Design a binder for this molecule. Structure first.
Ligand SMILES: *[C@@H]1O[C@H](CO)[C@@H](O[C@@H]2O[C@H](CO)[C@@H](O[C@@H]3O[C@H](CO[C@H]4O[C@H](CO[C@H]5O[C@H](CO)[C@@H](O)[C@H](O)[C@@H]5O)[C@@H](O)[C@H](O[C@H]5O[C@H](CO)[C@@H](O)[C@H](O)[C@@H]5O)[C@@H]4O)[C@@H](O)[C@H](O[C@H]4O[C@H](CO)[C@@H](O)[C@H](O)[C@@H]4O)[C@@H]3O)[C@H](O)[C@H]2NC(C)=O)[C@H](O)[C@H]1NC(C)=O
Ligand SMILES: *[C@@H]1O[C@H](CO)[C@@H](O[C@@H]2O[C@H](CO)[C@@H](O[C@@H]3O[C@H](CO[C@H]4O[C@H](CO[C@H]5O[C@H](CO)[C@@H](O)[C@H](O)[C@@H]5O)[C@@H](O)[C@H](O[C@H]5O[C@H](CO)[C@@H](O)[C@H](O)[C@@H]5O)[C@@H]4O)[C@@H](O)[C@H](O[C@H]4O[C@H](CO)[C@@H](O)[C@H](O)[C@@H]4O)[C@@H]3O)[C@H](O)[C@H]2NC(C)=O)[C@H](O)[C@H]1NC(C)=O
Ligand SMILES: *[C@@H]1O[C@H](CO)[C@@H](O[C@@H]2O[C@H](CO)[C@@H](O[C@@H]3O[C@H](CO[C@H]4O[C@H](CO[C@H]5O[C@H](CO)[C@@H](O)[C@H](O)[C@@H]5O)[C@@H](O)[C@H](O[C@H]5O[C@H](CO)[C@@H](O)[C@H](O)[C@@H]5O)[C@@H]4O)[C@@H](O)[C@H](O[C@H]4O[C@H](CO)[C@@H](O)[C@H](O)[C@@H]4O)[C@@H]3O)[C@H](O)[C@H]2NC(C)=O)[C@H](O)[C@H]1NC(C)=O
Ligand SMILES: *[C@@H]1O[C@H](CO)[C@@H](O[C@@H]2O[C@H](CO)[C@@H](O[C@@H]3O[C@H](CO[C@H]4O[C@H](CO)[C@@H](O)[C@H](O)[C@@H]4O)[C@@H](O)[C@H](O[C@H]4O[C@H](CO)[C@@H](O)[C@H](O)[C@@H]4O)[C@@H]3O)[C@H](O)[C@H]2NC(C)=O)[C@H](O)[C@H]1NC(C)=O
Ligand SMILES: *[C@@H]1O[C@H](CO)[C@@H](O[C@@H]2O[C@H](CO)[C@@H](O[C@@H]3O[C@H](CO[C@H]4O[C@H](CO)[C@@H](O)[C@H](O)[C@@H]4O)[C@@H](O)[C@H](O[C@H]4O[C@H](CO)[C@@H](O)[C@H](O)[C@@H]4O)[C@@H]3O)[C@H](O)[C@H]2NC(C)=O)[C@H](O)[C@H]1NC(C)=O
Ligand SMILES: *[C@@H]1O[C@H](CO)[C@@H](O[C@@H]2O[C@H](CO)[C@@H](O[C@@H]3O[C@H](CO)[C@@H](O)[C@H](O)[C@@H]3O)[C@H](O)[C@H]2NC(C)=O)[C@H](O)[C@H]1NC(C)=O
Ligand SMILES: *[C@@H]1O[C@H](CO)[C@@H](O[C@@H]2O[C@H](CO)[C@@H](O)[C@H](O)[C@H]2NC(C)=O)[C@H](O)[C@H]1NC(C)=O
Ligand SMILES: *[C@@H]1O[C@H](CO)[C@@H](O[C@@H]2O[C@H](CO)[C@@H](O)[C@H](O)[C@H]2NC(C)=O)[C@H](O)[C@H]1NC(C)=O
Ligand SMILES: *[C@@H]1O[C@H](CO)[C@@H](O[C@@H]2O[C@H](CO)[C@@H](O)[C@H](O)[C@H]2NC(C)=O)[C@H](O)[C@H]1NC(C)=O
Ligand SMILES: *[C@@H]1O[C@H](CO)[C@@H](O)[C@H](O)[C@H]1NC(C)=O
Ligand SMILES: *[C@@H]1O[C@H](CO)[C@@H](O)[C@H](O)[C@H]1NC(C)=O
Ligand SMILES: *[C@@H]1O[C@H](CO)[C@@H](O)[C@H](O)[C@H]1NC(C)=O
Lengths: 177, 323, 177, 323, 177, 323
């Protein structure tokens, strides 16, 4: 968690998602709904399954190799053959351990960043029409029906339409005393 | 919270009640919603004969077939991409040894071809096609099918001088031996010489072997041994065998080549699946990048690592609810 | 793209640029102008060309080594010499592939972060005098000439001078109804 | 959309119409505004003789120069940092072989010095300075310039017993040989002995070679061969040559040392450029971290990788406009 | 300096701190104080000493190995033994250099991000009660005594209590002319 | 700037006036508040004998103790996990050599056990307990305690044909030798034969050594040498001794096992510490991941690297105050 969008301001995870990885949750006067962002999850899918593509498909065809098991004990050259084969295993053991360590850490940071930028992208769209609780939620001060919630969902929301209305509900509290 | 007023819009990430543990650069124990395994730790248990040709060693070993053992009589001019010799192999002919057994076995396996074309060597004043009582094919005395036990005729063993030019375009493989007699009385009986000597040479390399007379422990009711050498003749070269005595003459040459063939020691039964790797434990799936079933592999096998488990994180961190 | 400042909110690149890496574009009532930020590009240049310095210049002087080509077929000792040399090539092939992959990914994320922090630094300087359109482009509300943009361009801008002016254009829309 | 009251200020990055493809950990195909190449894939095509001294093998090989072959007569006491022997080298003197050719060739190459100081061996009652008809220098019969073909005088070959202790402070290199005659008549005519025997020993290691009489195929109109051994005498040691017969005696010692010299097989012509690496293909630039032109390298050469191309990202992602 | 919370908007360091890694400095009418955030430094400490745990404790027990020093000069097999041991040293030299380089860079980036998210977490709590000068400092416009300053320190701050007061001191400057 | 109406709250990070330099992927020189060293560059300067058992070679070498050298008379049936032989070891008995010294020394070190059980070989009509004037134990002539110098009795040397089959469940080690006489008169005086021959053969492998008569340089007032071979008898083989003469017969077998034992060359003052790694330079701490003191290590030692310094950042970037 190098960005902070996972296990940071977000308390838990939404087990009720089957249509994507990252989604939204809203409640209006006309009802409550849920939907996921296809663009965000698709980007993280490419940068995760792509690592599988790099790992799988290596060409390392090897046919004839030195003997690695010995039924006898001869001396010097037998020791050298065992030492070479063992050294190759030891070097590749560290290569495998290092590779999985870097891939796992990068994957965790990649999904962490992919949702931190979704929060930033959404907040940029809403402008000063809303705010944040510090738990990932917003407060769209305009009287938003189902249409405008979905309009934000596929990245189309004219803030100037609800601009003067939201300012009343954010700054003009109790008629400024 | 919820209200009869402006809005609430939260964002989330999916999770599962039961995740998988993985290892990262900073956390030796961290939960991930989905992880995969990278190292193969299991085998089908059966060697598979596709696509690489696989020849079962049967009851004997490669060098036993290289000499003409009756137990290997079914290996007459057979090729293979992998010779799976078995641990239950037993020598069932005249006792023999190779001073460079490791080098000879690896060389023949690399060629992966037992093609044999006999050549009529010009032995004069000697008894050819010699047999022995320690190798009974069809209940009759015989010897190695690829070797020629020369024995003195009429108690006379004239000195030999033979040649064999190479006119082909590949490295011929002449395999010959020297007979070490158990007792001095034996040395006179078959060879009629106090002490023999052997010289096999070409234009590039020469060899010379003096038999070592001496009694040796009895195996298969034979106190003597035969030590088997080999020589390689390139195109444009010429072989020359001098052979004062005690020569187990060759019969032909083996067509040496280079390819993708090798040898392996295994006991898994032969099956009929399709696999790109063969290991002594058995054929393994070829999808995982690493494996730890066996260090000795043939084909396009994954790399061998000491670690038995390596989990790769595919999903994000699993942070459940409740509790 | 682990920050999202490249191919993220910035839709497209600027092929009409030769004087720097990251820069500015602005249009006022007196005309449209362009100028680069020498500070931002220099930070990324040092942290990119430095990777070239680390790679180039390694001292690995080796003079006497085992035979690597053979006109003979010896057997045991010939196979071992080939196996050792081949193993060295195979291990170094993975080292080169892994190194170039990590360097390229880190370089791409490094330049991506450099624009993200330039946007963050610029936004901090402007305080609440302006906003963001969601495409990396701010909307300055002060009645500003060519003077301010150059002053912001080299990190010197007192928002207090234009503070009370930008407030009317941002919050006092249509006289709050 | 432009206006008259407020201002507008956007941020951007530079890009080029035609970028370069690179490979990252997550994208096998991604565009970068500028990329460099890490692996060298080309050579100048000519070896270069600076800064390391490079000696052209010419018409013969290193061991041929180690013996005094007339074809390598111009290598009289010459040193090198890299002996570039050519594939067209041909033996043009008395036939010979080395039982440990691989060990002897690598040992002499490592020293990289053919310094010779002849020593007066005390051979008595024998005809020294032996000549053969298979080594014609100046149209006259001769032999190896570093060897001494001892032959019986007045049909008598008295047994030798000589010694040569070491006073110097370096490992001397005595190179001697054993003459294998083709026929028994040749053995008696040259050496007047039914069967010779040789013993070359020091205080630390001993050697004993029994000549192997036997006819061998004719090369350069000579049916016999000479097998050449070598011995190392460290300071404080004393060499002892017994030599009952059949000895191709040494003449002096080669000053063996250790350094940065080696041998290489190549056919590229020698040039005059400055380069820090030499490969059989030719000298290569010494700036790229990796290379794939040739696995056999000398000097501070870059590492060898199988991949022919490796592009390193030097700029940001190239995302053009339009379209 | 990937994120920019170290050597970025923060000008200098604080040598006067022994109770933590990341801290606060505030000035009120009743006095000036300083205290560190134990939660932030502990998160980085676990991810800093954890790298030490991975490196230390590897099991690589080796007892019998080929000869590595030679008092004689043999030839072919002597050269092969030297080449194998030297190759193992060269490969492990690159593995150690690469590992220490990746660990150090990730360490610097980790501490850089750990304080960037502390700035983000603090700013989220303050809502619109304050602003930023672009150097990691805020202006809490509320008449904050010592109690509320420390209330923010241990993550408990209801902005609604000081909401209308902060808006007066931030937007109603000189009575909007 | 302070005031009397609002508040102010900034953020910061700790720093040190004097930091440590480290190396990262993008900065060859960068300051960090705290860093640690990863490579060990120093040792205690002395070997130590815990937890692995360590046996000091003393005044002789392992093979000298394998034969019964009076210098190593105190190594009678002693086991070890690491034989620390010294560079000052000097042979103090009958001169000897091993054709495969490297192979024999490594094999005995791997077993790590000098257990000896003498077997009563049935020598008939020969003088046993052959003594030499080149080895004084207690100011009296003697020989190797593990070897038996057979010498003809009453100027008669009957041929020998004896066996010793294996009943145990471990590989026996019969170490024998062949005596090379300096002069022909010495050959007749000791063995009463014109030329000897030796044959040591089992059911699996055979050997045959013919003594090489010849004068050799004098060391310790002895012009002759003994070359020592060895044979391994598996649980089921039968050793067979067959020689007309010149046999330095064995006295028993050395029990061979496999374990965590090896030899090492060192000159450090063996002490009483506890450490899991033993290098020739001394004992090193077993906590740092890498080390550069010595390439030769025994135990759970860290990995040798060329770099003498590797600093790991265990903190944050140190950007200080002032200036
Ligand atoms: C130099 O020294 C060497 C070493 O000592 C010496 O060589 C020994 O020579 C002696 C003779 O002088 C050899 O002994 C002979 O071996 C012959 C065969 O006997 C063995 O084989 C029998 C058959 O087994 C086969 O067949 C069965 C099925 O029938 C099958 O299951 C088996 O697997 C195998 O294929 C076997 O039955 C027999 O075992 C019997 O005897 C042993 C020993 O007593 C006992 O332990 C068993 O329980 C069982 O009773 C054995 O293994 C054969 O020629 C000969 O036997 C005949 O002669 C003797 C003597 O006259 C009679 O008593 C006997 O009834 C038979 O008529 C005899 O046993 C011995 O093997 C050699 N040793 C070695 C190590 O090689 C040299 O001679 C010496 N001199 C010189 C100059 O070199
Ligand atoms: C045991 O068996 C072995 C193996 O069989 C046997 O060894 C053979 O012995 C015979 C003789 O008994 C050898 O044959 C002799 O070779 C001698 C030289 O002939 C060769 O060299 C000629 C010269 O070439 C040189 O010079 C030219 C320039 O002039 C140059 O270009 C060359 O490169 C090179 O430097 C060459 O011309 C000649 O080639 C002719 O002959 C061959 C074969 O017929 C033919 O193919 C060619 O087209 C060409 O016509 C050849 O290569 C020489 O002593 C001798 O020739 C004389 O004697 C014969 C017989 O009396 C006369 O007919 C002839 O006119 C000459 O006077 C003869 O040719 C043979 O080479 C041996 N082979 C091997 C493999 O070793 C042993 O003798 C047997 N016995 C014992 C006890 O060991
Ligand atoms: C084939 O050729 C070879 C090579 O030439 C040849 O071998 C040489 O043979 C000669 C004899 O023919 C050998 O010389 C003999 O060596 C014997 C011993 O002398 C050596 O040892 C003495 C004792 O040293 C021991 O003890 C002391 C304590 O006392 C201790 O410190 C030592 O470490 C060691 O343990 C030593 O004193 C002596 O050194 C003296 O002499 C040398 C040489 O002159 C001189 O440099 C020294 O300063 C010192 O004075 C030496 O190292 C011994 O048998 C013999 O000595 C007796 O005979 C001669 C001649 O009759 C008398 O003059 C003398 O007084 C004694 O009675 C003689 O010295 C020589 O070592 C051989 N060399 C080699 C390299 O092997 C073969 O014989 C030839 N023939 C055949 C058929 O092979
Ligand atoms: C490689 O192959 C060659 C070819 O076979 C072998 O060479 C033969 O070697 C054998 C011995 O192994 C030779 O046979 C004997 O050679 C001798 C010839 O006598 C010479 O010297 C006397 C001196 O007085 C002269 O009179 C005579 O003319 C010869 O110059 C004699 O020892 C033998 O001859 C006697 O015995 C025979 C017994 O049958 C009688 O017939 C004779 O009349 C005479 O009494 C005998 O001939 C043979 O000659 C060699 N052949 C050739 C062509 O040279 C090599 O030995 C072989 N090498 C190896 C290493 O295997
Ligand atoms: C290393 O070098 C040494 C030194 O040269 C060699 O030793 C010589 O070996 C040769 C044989 O190769 C010896 O020469 C012969 O030695 C014998 C000596 O006879 C002994 O036995 C008889 C028994 O009746 C005694 O009467 C006599 O005194 C001796 O004790 C004889 O076979 C020969 O002598 C006969 O023939 C010659 C022929 O010329 C006649 O002059 C003689 O009068 C006599 O009839 C012959 O002398 C030689 O003696 C050895 N030299 C020494 C100094 O010992 C090694 O062989 C050599 N080793 C190797 C491995 O190369
Ligand atoms: C010892 O072995 C040789 C060969 O090494 C034996 O030669 C054999 O001779 C017979 C003669 O009848 C050959 O049989 C014939 O072969 C062909 C078909 O293969 C054809 O002409 C006839 O139909 C007949 O079958 C036989 O092939 C040949 N063996 C080999 C391997 O070619 C020889 O008889 C044996 N004995 C002696 C004393 O040499
Ligand atoms: C974004 O998604 C919402 C629904 O998730 C879309 O809203 C619908 O818009 C259509 C016209 O395009 C109306 O007829 C429907 O009544 C709307 N549905 C609801 C539930 O309000 C919206 O159009 C989407 N926008 C785009 C550009 O795809
Ligand atoms: C940033 O650059 C701008 C110009 O791009 C500088 O503004 C100039 O300031 C000087 C005095 O320093 C005036 O005489 C010019 O008239 C200004 N030019 C314009 C176009 O307004 C500004 O000073 C620079 N700031 C710094 C800190 O160097
Ligand atoms: C956060 O820390 C501050 C002090 O740094 C705490 O404030 C104290 O609160 C107690 C009651 O809990 C009062 O009696 C003290 O007078 C307060 N101290 C000061 C200096 O104002 C505050 O309670 C802490 N908050 C939490 C949630 O633990
Ligand atoms: C309050 O909620 C009721 C339904 O319970 C709804 O009809 C009404 O419009 C809501 N009032 C406001 C002001 O949103
Ligand atoms: C409109 O633009 C003119 C110049 O074309 C300028 O003088 C005037 O001030 C601008 N008016 C406003 C309201 O921005
Ligand atoms: C550049 O890219 C274009 C496509 O954008 C391609 O058609 C063209 O061949 C490339 N090269 C040049 C030199 O224009």
């Amino acid at each position: 968690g190098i960005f902070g969008a996972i296990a940071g301001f977000i308390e838990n995870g939404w087990e009720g998602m089957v249509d994507g990885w990252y989604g939204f949750r809203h409640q209006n006067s006309e009802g409550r709904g849920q939907a996921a962002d296809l663009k965000s999850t698709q980007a993280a899918i490419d940068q995760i399954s792509g690592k599988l593509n790099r790992l799988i498909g290596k060409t390392n065809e090897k046919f004839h190799q030195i003997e690695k098991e010995f039924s006898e004990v001869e001396g010097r050259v037998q020791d050298l053959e065992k030492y070479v084969e063992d050294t190759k295993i030891d070097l590749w053991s560290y290569n495998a351990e290092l590779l999985v360590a870097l891939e796992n850490q990068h994957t965790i940071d990649l999904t962490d960043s992919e949702m931190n930028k979704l929060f930033e992208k959404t907040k940029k769209q809403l402008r000063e029409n809303a705010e944040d609780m510090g738990n990932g939620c917003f407060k769209i001060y305009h009287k938003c029906d189902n249409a405008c919630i979905g309009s934000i969902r596929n990245e189309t929301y004219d803030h100037n339409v609800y601009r003067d209305e939201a300012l009343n509900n954010r700054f003009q509290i109790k008629g400024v005393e | 919270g919820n209200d009869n007023s402006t809005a609430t819009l939260c964002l989330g990430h999916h999770a599962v009640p039961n995740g998988t543990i993985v290892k990262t650069i900073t956390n030796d124990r961290i939960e991930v919603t989905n992880a995969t395994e990278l190292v193969q730790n299991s085998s089908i248990g059966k060697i598979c004969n596709s696509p690489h040709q696989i020849l079962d060693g049967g009851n004997c070993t490669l060098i036993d077939a290289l000499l003409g053992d009756p137990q290997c009589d079914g290996f007459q001019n057979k090729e293979w991409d992998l010779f799976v010799e078995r641990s239950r192999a037993n020598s069932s002919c005249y006792p023999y040894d190779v001073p460079d057994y490791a080098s000879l076995r690896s060389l023949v396996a690399s060629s992966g071809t037992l093609e044999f074309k006999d050549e009529s060597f010009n032995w004069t004043g000697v008894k050819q096609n010699g047999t022995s009582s320690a190798c009974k094919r069809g209940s009759s005395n015989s010897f190695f099918s690829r070797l020629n036990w020369l024995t003195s005729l009429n108690n006379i063993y004239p000195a030999q001088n033979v040649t064999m030019p190479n006119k082909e375009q590949f490295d011929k493989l002449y395999i010959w031996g020297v007979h070490h007699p158990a007792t001095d009385k034996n040395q006179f009986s078959l060879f009629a010489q106090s002490s023999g000597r052997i010289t096999v040479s070409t234009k590039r390399s020469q060899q010379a072997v003096i038999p070592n007379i001496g009694s040796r422990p009895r195996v298969r009711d034979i106190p003597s041994r035969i030590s088997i050498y080999w020589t390689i003749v390139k195109p444009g070269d010429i072989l020359l065998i001098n052979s004062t005595g005690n020569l187990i003459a060759p019969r032909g040459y083996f067509k040496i080549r280079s390819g993708k063939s090798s040898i392996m020691r295994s006991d898994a039964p032969i099956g009929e699946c399709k696999s790109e790797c063969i290991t002594p434990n058995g054929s393994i799936p070829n999808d995982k990048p690493f494996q730890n079933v066996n260090r000795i592999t043939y084909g396009a096998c994954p790399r061998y690592v000491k670690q038995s488990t390596l989990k790769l994180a595919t999903g994000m961190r699993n942070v459940p609810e409740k509790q």
